[PDB]
C-alpha cells in the first residue's frame, strides 16, 4: 500500500497539480477552436462563451473528429480476430479444427458488434474522440455488463481524473474524481456514506474517488473506491493484469511525460495568429460602419436645413462644404487579408478541411473507409495508428473478455476464446 | 551473434567514420530556416497593419 498510502483523496491531490499545465493548454486551445469544449473550472452556468473570431480551428476540429471516427470506428469490422492455437502447428494440422473454431470468431466478432450496437457505444467514442482533439488526454471507463441492462461507458475529461506514468509508459496510478448526489449514489455507496455517519441531503453532492495502482508485490491492479475518506466496503477488487476497464488514451505520446498532448497544440500559433488578424479585420470593418458627417466649419451648409428638408427639397448649400469620415486603411486591409487567408491555407491542410475528398459519395464503404485511413496517416502523424494501438486495442480487449462470459465460445481453449486482435487497416474491409 | 542481435541501430544518412546517422532535414534545414525567417517577417509585418 505504498501508493494508497496518503489515500484517495492526498494522492489526487498532489498528482492534480501535475496536470495542471495539461489543463491549462486545454483550455487554452479549446479558448481558439471551440470554448465550450473544455471550459474552466470556475465558470459554469453563465459562463456565455465568446466566439472565436476566426471559425477555422471550429471547423477544423469537428472535421477532425469526424474523419478520425469514420476510419476508427466505421459500420465495417474494425478488429480482426486472428487464430493460433500453435504458433504454426495449427495450419498444419487439424485444419478443418480451424474452420469450426474461426467459425466461431465470427460470431464471437459479430456479437461484439451487437454489443456496441445495443448499448451505444459510439456516441461516447466521438466526444472521446473530440477531447483528444482539444484536449491532450482523454479517459474511457467500461462498466460491467450487469445484465441485458443498458450499460453506456463513462467518459471522463481530463479535468476530472488523474494518472501518474513513468518513462517506460507504463501507469503506476490513476484516480478518478466522480460528484454524484446523495440520492443518486449506488446502492453500495450510499450505504458507506450513511454508515460513515452525518445526515445527507438528497440534492447534495458527495465525491467519490476511485484510485487504481500497481502493487509493488506482484504486478497486478487494485481497485477501490473511497468516500469522503472512507473506502467503500466491498469495492476493494483487483483488476486482471494489464486489462483494467480504465482506458487512459493519449492522443500525441511524449518520453518521461504522464499526459498527453492535443494535436491542436502542434498548430496552436498558427491558430492564434489567425485570431489576432481576423479581429482586426472585423473591427475595422466597425469603424467603417459608423457613419460621420464631416461638416467644413468655413462652408455656407449647415446642417439644420439637410435634417429637415424632405425629400427632394432645394437646400442652400455646396456639396464639398459635407464630407463623411472614411477608415483609409486599405494597403493595411489587404496585406492583413492576404496574410490571413496564406494562414488558413496552412491550416487548412493541417485539419483536412473538406476539398471534396470525403464530402463526394453519398455512401459509406469500405473503400472510402482506407481511402480516409491513408488520408488520416498523411496528415496528422500517425494518429491512426497510435489510436489504433492506445484506444481500438484495449477497447476490444475489454469487451471481449466481459463477451466470453455472456457467450460461452464452442471452443473450450482460451486461444479460441481469445484470439489475437488486429485493429488495423487489415481489420477494415472483409480481408 | 552479430546477425541475431535484437538491438538494433539504425542510421539513415551514412557517413564513413561516424558512429550515428545524419537526418535528412538537415540538409534542408539550412533552408526551412530561411523560409522561417521570411514567414516570420511576412506574419509580423502584418501584425503592425
Redesign the interface.
Known sequence: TGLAEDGAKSVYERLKNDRAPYETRAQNCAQYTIPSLFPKDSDNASTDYQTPWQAVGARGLNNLASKLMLALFPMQTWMRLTISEYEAKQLLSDPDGLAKVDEGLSMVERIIMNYIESNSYRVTLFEALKQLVVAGNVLLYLPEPEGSNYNPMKLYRLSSYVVQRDAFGNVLQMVTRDQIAFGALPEDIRKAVEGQGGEKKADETIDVYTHIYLDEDSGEYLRYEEVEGMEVQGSDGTYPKEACPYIPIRMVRLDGESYGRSYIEEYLGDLR?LE??QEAIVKMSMISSKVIGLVNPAGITQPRRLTKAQTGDFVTGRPEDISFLQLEKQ???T??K???D??EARLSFAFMLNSAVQRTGERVTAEEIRYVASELEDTLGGVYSILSQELQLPLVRVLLKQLQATQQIPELPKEAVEPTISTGLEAIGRG
Open positions: 495568429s489576432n488578424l494597403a493595411d486591409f496585406v492583413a492576404a496574410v490571413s496564406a494562414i
